[PDB]
Amino acid sequence: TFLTTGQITPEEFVQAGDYLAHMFPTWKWNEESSDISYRDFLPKNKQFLIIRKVPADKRAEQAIDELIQDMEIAQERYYDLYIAYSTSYRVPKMYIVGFNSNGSPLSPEQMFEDISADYRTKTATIEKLPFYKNSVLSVSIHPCKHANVMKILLDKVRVDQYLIVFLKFITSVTPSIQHD
Amino acid sequence: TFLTTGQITPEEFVQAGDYLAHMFPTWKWNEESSDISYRDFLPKNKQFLIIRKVPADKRAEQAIDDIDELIQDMEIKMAQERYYDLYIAYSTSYRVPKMYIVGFNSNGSPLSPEQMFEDISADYRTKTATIEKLPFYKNSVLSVSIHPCKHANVMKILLDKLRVDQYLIVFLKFITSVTPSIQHDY
Amino acid sequence: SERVLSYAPAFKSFLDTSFFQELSRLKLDVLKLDSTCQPLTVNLDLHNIPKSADQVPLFLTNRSFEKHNNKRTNEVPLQGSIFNFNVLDEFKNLDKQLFLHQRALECWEDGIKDINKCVSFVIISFADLKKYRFYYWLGVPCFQRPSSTVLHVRPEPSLKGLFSKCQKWFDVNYSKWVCILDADDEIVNYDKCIIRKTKVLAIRDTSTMENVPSALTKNFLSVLQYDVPDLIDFKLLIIRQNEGSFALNATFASIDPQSSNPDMKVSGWERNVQGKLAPRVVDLSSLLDPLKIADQSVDLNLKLMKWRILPDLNLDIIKNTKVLLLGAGTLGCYVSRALIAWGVRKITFVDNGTVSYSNPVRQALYNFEDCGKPKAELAAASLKRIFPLMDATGVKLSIPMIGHKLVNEEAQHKDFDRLRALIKEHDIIFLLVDSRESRWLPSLLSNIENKTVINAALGFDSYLVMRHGNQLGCYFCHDVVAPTDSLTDRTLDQMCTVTRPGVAMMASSLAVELMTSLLQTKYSGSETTVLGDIPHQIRGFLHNFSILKLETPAYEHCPACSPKVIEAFTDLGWEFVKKALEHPLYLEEISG
Amino acid sequence: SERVLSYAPAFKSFLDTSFFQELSRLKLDVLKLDSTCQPLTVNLDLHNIPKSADQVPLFLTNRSFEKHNNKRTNEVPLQGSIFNFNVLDEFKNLDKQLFLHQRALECWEDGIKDINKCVSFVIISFADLKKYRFYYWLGVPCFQRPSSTVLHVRPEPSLKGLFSKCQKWFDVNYSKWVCILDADDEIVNYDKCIIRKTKVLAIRDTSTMENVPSALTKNFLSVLQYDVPDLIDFKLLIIRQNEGSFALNATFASIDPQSSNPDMKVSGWERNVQGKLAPRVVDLSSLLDPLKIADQSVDLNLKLMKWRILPDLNLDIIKNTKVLLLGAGTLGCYVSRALIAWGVRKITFVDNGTVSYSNPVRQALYNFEDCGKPKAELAAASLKRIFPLMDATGVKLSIPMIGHKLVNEEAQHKDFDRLRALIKEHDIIFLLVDSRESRWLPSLLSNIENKTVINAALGFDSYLVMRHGNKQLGCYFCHDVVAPTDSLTDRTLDQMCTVTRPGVAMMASSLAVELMTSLLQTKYSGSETTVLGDIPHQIRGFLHNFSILKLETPAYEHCPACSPKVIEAFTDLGWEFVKKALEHPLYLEEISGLSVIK
Lengths: 180, 186, 592, 598
Ligand SMILES: [Zn+2]
Ligand SMILES: [Zn+2]
What we know:
The complex is a heterotetramer, with two copies of chain A and two copies of chain C.
Chain A: H1 2-5, H2 10-23, E1 28-29, E2 48-56, H3 65-70, E3 77-86, E4 91-99, H4 108-111, H5 117-120, E5 125-128, E6 137-141, H6 149-154, H7 162-173
Antiparallel strand pairs in A: 1-2, 2-3, 3-4, 4-6, 5-6
Chain C: E1 3-4, E2 11-15, H1 17-28, E3 36-44, E4 56-60, E5 76-85, H2 88-93, H3 96-113, E6 121-128, E7 133-144, E8 149-155, H4 162-172, E9 178-181, E10 187-188, H5 192-198, E11 200-204, H6 216-227, E12 233-239, E13 246-254, E14 265-269, E15 280-283, H7 285-288, H8 290-308, H9 315-319, E16 322-326, H10 330-341, E17 346-350, H11 359-362, H12 375-386, E18 391-395, H13 409-425, E19 428-431, H14 440-449, E20 452-458, E21 462-467, H15 502-519, E22 528-529, E23 532-533, E24 537-541, E25 546-550, H16 563-582, H17 584-591
Parallel strand pairs in C: 2-4, 5-6, 11-12, 16-17, 16-19, 17-18, 19-20
Antiparallel strand pairs in C: 1-8, 3-5, 6-7, 7-14, 7-15, 8-13, 9-10, 9-11, 12-13, 20-21, 21-24, 22-23, 24-25
Helix pairs in contact in C: 10-15, 13-14, 16-17
The complex binds zinc ion (ZN) (2 copies).
One zinc ion binds near residues 477, 555 and 560 of chain C.
PDB class: protein transport
Keywords: Ubiquitin-like protein activation enzyme, Ubiquitin-like protein transfer enzyme, protein transport
Assembly: tetrameric
C-alpha cells in the first residue's frame, strides 16, 4: 500500500506517530489548546507531533547596548521541530522553529544557515505554522517529491516506523541539529 | 509682428477685442465678478469675451417615469432650436485665442456634452474637440473646447490672405467653420 | 382694424448649470426641510434677443443669487425670487394659479406706489440632489385689474419718429419700464397728473413678436387705469430695441363691469416647447455627476481611436463582452486593467486564494493593507475603486487540478457546477491559472459551452498566449514545448516557477489585444481584422526580445476537446470528470 | 573532602514569538497604566533537558498566560508572573535587588504554609510595540533565610538505590518539589514532624551541572530550618531524571548569626550568554512586523530566481538603482510597478499635471477618488500603499517643450535647475514624457550628467524603447525615428494628443524595465549579452502583427541634443543657450551644424 505509493492515510499517521512517540518519548503529540486550528480528519489530540529545543552546535554548511550596560547589576542553537500531515501530498510535512544561545527566537534568515545547501535554495520556505490559530513564523520543507524520497529509502533490506525512516531523511536536511 | 506669426500678445488680445465689442456690440467683455478665477497678465475686466444665446436651427451634419406621469398632472389645462453661449479666452501656452461653447436646448435648459458635439463640424470634432470646464470660473461649468493644438498655423494662413484690431474678427471667420450651424452674429 | 389687444409671454427662461450648482450648495447647507424663499436678480439684455426667440432671455446663473452682482450699460435689472421646496409633494400640490395670483398682488401693491416697480418673476423648484434632477417652473405675474377691462386697439403709424427718443430714453433710464410725453412731446417719467392731460404712454417691451406686446403690458395698464379711472382713449407706444416698435390708438373697454373691490386676472406661468403649461424637469447628471462625467470622458477616449484612426472599429462589442477571468494572480490583475482601458464593463474574477505579503509588488490590484484578505472579491473591489461603474464581481472558488485525488466530493461538486455556470453566463473566458493541471477542467467546459478561450501561461522568461476559438487546437491538443527544449522554456506553466516581472505584463497586454482584435469582423479570405492579425498562438521570450506566432490543428486524441472526450462528458456528466481528475490514464483511453 | 555548598541557576529562559505576540494582542500600549501584573504558568519537563544547557528550559509562549490549560503527564507546573512596564525609564530604574527580594518574601509566606509552593519565577518587561523591540529579564527568587546560614556538604555514596524510587516518586507527584523518608525508609510527603526524626530530604533538582544543585535548593532548606531549627545534620538527596542524581551529608552552619528578626539573602536574576547580570533586548521585527515580513518575502521571491535559475544574476545592483521617472502617465505608472516587482527601492516621479477623469482606466496608479489631485505626489503615494518600505517621492515640475515661447522665465528657469538636480541625483533616468518636444532638454541634461537614459515613446499601435548614454550609439534625436513617408499609424509615435491602444503602453513599460535590469548586469567576454539576455540599443514593437524589431543607430555629428557643438554651447552658456533653443529652435540646428547641411 504505502510502500508502493510512498504515502500514508491519516489513520496510518496516527500509527507511526504513536510509535515514534513511544520509541523516542522525546517526541510528543500536541495537547488540546484553544490556539490550535484543528483538522476534522485527525483526532483533536493526534494533530501534530512535536520535539522541543534540540541543540544545534554548528551551522549547516560546516557540519540599547547602553541601556543593557546601565542596567547591568557562532554560538549554540536550539530547535523546536514539528511534524504535521500534508493533505495534498499524502505524506508527513516538516516545520522548524529556532532559538539562539540566549533562548530568543532566530530570524528567518538565521534559520536558513541551518538548512543544507541544496535544500536551502531549492526546497524550503518561510511559513506560518499552519496548525496554530494566530500564528508563528518558521522554516518549512516542501512535501514536493518526498515520495519519491520515502519510497526510495523505504525499499531497504512495517508501517509503524514510517516516521523513523522519514526522520533520518530529515537529518539530511538539517544536519547540524543533533540526532539519535 | 503678429501677421508674421499669426499670434498675439496679452496686450494685443485686449485691442483686437476692444475693437470686436465696439464693432459687434453683441460680444461683451466679462464683468468684474467674484466667481471668476482671475489671470494677472490681463486686466480684471478684460479677461475674456462673451456672446450669449446665439441660435443654431439645424445641426452641423446638415448645415421610473413617473417624471413624465408627474409633469402631466402638475399641468394646468422648430425643436430643438438650440442656443449657444460662446466665450473667447486667451491661451498662454500658445499665443492664440481659444474658444469655448456652452449650449442650451429649445426649452432653454443645458445640453449634454454628447448633444453639443452634434454642432461641431465632423472634421474639427474628431481631431480638435474636447470637453472642459470654463477655466475662468471657479465653481465650474462643462463646455466643449476648441483647442490649440495648431491654430496659426490656421490663423497665419488666413493672414497669408491690416492692423491688429481686427485679429479677432478674422478668428471669428475661422470659428464659424467649426460650428457652421450657429448663426453668424459675428 | 380694429382689434382686441392680445399679448406675448414676457420672458424665455434659460437655466445655466451654475444656477443648479449654487442651488445645491445652499440646499446642502440646511437640514430643516421647510420650504424657503430667496430674492433673485437677472440683468436683461433687450438689445440681444436671439432671432428665433419671441421674447427676451431670462438667464439664471449662480450669480442670480448674489443680490445685484454689478451690471452693464443698457441692461435692465429684473428683481425676482425663488421658492425652493424640499418635499416633492409640496412642489406638486401647490395651487399654481393661487400662487401666481398672490405674487401678482405684491406687484400690484408695489405698482401703485411706483408704476416702474410692478414687474417681477418667480421660480418654484424641487432639487433631487442624489439623482442630479431639478424641477422648476418660471412664473411672470402679469395682471389685468380689474379683469373686466380689456383694450381695443388700432394702428397709429403717425407717432413713428418718437421711437428713437424712447429707445434712447430707455437705454439711459435702465430702472424704468414706462415713460410719457409732456406738453411739448418730450419724454419724461410717468406722472398721473401729466398723462391725464397728455394721453401718451410708452412701454419698454420684452417681446419681439410682430405687433404683439409682452404680457407685462397688462400690469402697466392696470396701474394706469387706477391712477386715471376716467381715461378712455390714449396713444400707446410699444418700444423695442430692434426695428419692430409700433404705436397703437388705444381704448379701454369693459366686459362685465362690477360696481364698487376690483378683482384680478393673472396669467404668466411659462410653457414648455410642447406648448403645455407644465413644470420643467431636468437631468443634469451628465453635466454635474462626477461618476457620469468620467464614464463620458472614457467613452470619448475610445471613440477618438475610432474617429481619428480606425473608423471601422467596433468599440461596443467590446464594451458588452462579459469577461470571466479565471485567476486573480499576476495575470488576472493586468489583463483586467487592459480590459477596462478598452471599455469592458462586466468582469468577473475567480480565485480560491488569499492576498499574500509578496503579492502586491507583482499583482497590480492589491495594496499592502490587503494582505490576508480573499483575492477574488478584493480584486473586483479594486476595479470598482478605479472605475465605480464597473460590474466587477469576485467569486472565491477552487478549481480542481487534474492528477489529484479529491478532498471533498460534495464541496468540489459544488465548485464544479458553480464553475460551469459562471462560464455559460460569460462571453469570453481568460484562463489565467498557475499551472496546467488547473487548466484542464476550464478548457473542457469552455469547449462544451462553445466559448472563446484566451489562455495565458508563464515561464521564467517566456509566455504563451492562445485562443481555442468557437478547427484550431486547444491548449491541450499538442505539447506546448518539446521535452528537448531549454530548461527555461520548460518552466512554461509550472506551478513552482518564479518569473521575470515583465513576462506577466507582456502576456497580459497581448492576451487583451488578441481579444479585441478577435471580436472584430474578419476580412475576406484572410485571418486579419481592422486591428490586425488574429494569430492562434503567440509565444514570446525576454532574453532575446522575440515573438513567435503559430498555429495548431485540433487533435483527434486530445484529452480536452477530442470528440470522444466530449461524448463521454455530456453522457456521464460529473461522474466522468471525477474519474478523469483522479485517473488520468483513464482519460487517455477515452481520447485514444 | 568537605565543601561549602554552591548552586547553579535554576532555569534557562526561552522566549517564543507567541509570547511577545500575546503581549501585543492584550493591547497594553493602548492602556494608560504605568505597569501591569499578570500571572504566568509554564510546565517544566525535567526529562528533556538539552545537553548544552545546565538547567531546565523555562519556555514562555502565548499559552503561558492561560493559567490552567492542559498539562502533559509528569510535567511540573511552575507559577510565575510578568510585570510589564509602559515607561522604559521605570523599567530601567527599577531597583532589581529590592524587587526580587519582594518576590522572595512571597515565596517565603507561601513556603511556610506549604514547602512545595516556595518556588516561583518573574518576568519584568518593556515592550517597544512599534520598533518590535522587547526588553525582558527573568528573575528566579532563591533565598537563604536567614542570610547567616550556609551549608557544609560531603559526598554520600551510600544512598544509591533511593534515586530510582525518588525519580519515580517525583514523576507521579508532579506538584511536589520535596519528599522525605519516614521511619521505614519509605518515600513520603514532606512533614516537619517526620523529618525532625528521620532527617532525610530529597529535592527535585532543576540543574544538570555535575554535583551542583539548582539554587531553588536554598528556598527549601530555608523552610526546613524554620520547621526544624534544632537540625544540624541530615542527608540531602539531589534528584534528577537522568543519571546524575547525588546524595550528600549536609550540615547547617552559620556565618555572623543575628540575635536569637531574620533577614534574608536573595538572588536569581538570570544572566546572558556573556555571563552578565543584565536584561535581554530583542528585535522581533523580522518575525512579527508585517512591513519587515513582506519586505523580506519580496526579496526571497527575487533570490529564488538567482538560486534556481540565474546564479550569477546581480539582484543587488538593481535594488539600489535610483530611478527617476520623467512622466507619471500611462508609462510612468506601469514602469514603476515593474520596477518594484524587480525590487527597486528609490523611485522619484516628475510630472506637472493632475489626475483627470479619463486617467485611472489607463494609468495604473490612480483611482476614481483621486481625480483632480496632483499626479506626481499621488503616484509616489500609490507606490507606498503597495509597498510602504518604498522611498517613493513625487515632484510637481514642468518640463519645457522645445519650440514653445516661455510663459514665465524665472519659474521655468527654476524648473530647469531643479530638473538637472534630480537628474544628477539619480542613476537611471526614464523618459516617459508625452511628446518629443519634451524629450529634448532632459535628453541633453542626462547626456551632460553622464546618465543612462531609457526613452519610451508611443504611437497608436506601436512603440519605441531605447537607451542613451554609458562603440558610440547616439541618442533619441540623432536619427529621425520615423520617416515622413511612413504610414499614418507609425507616424503617431510620440505625438501628443494621440490616443494609443491600451496594450501598447504595457508592452513598452515591461520591455523598458527588462532592458534596464539587463543593462545593469555585467556583459559577457566579447559578446553583447548579459546573464539576462541581449541589451539592444532600440526595440520597436507593432501590435497589428504582434512583432518586435531590434536595431542600433550611430551617434550623429549634427545631432541637436548630442553634437559636440551642442555640448560645447551648453557647457559654457548654460541657461541662456537653453532658453534660446527652446524658443527659436532653428538656432539649435544653426549650432549643431544641421543648418549647414540643408
Ligand atoms: Zn484539444
Ligand atoms: Zn544625439
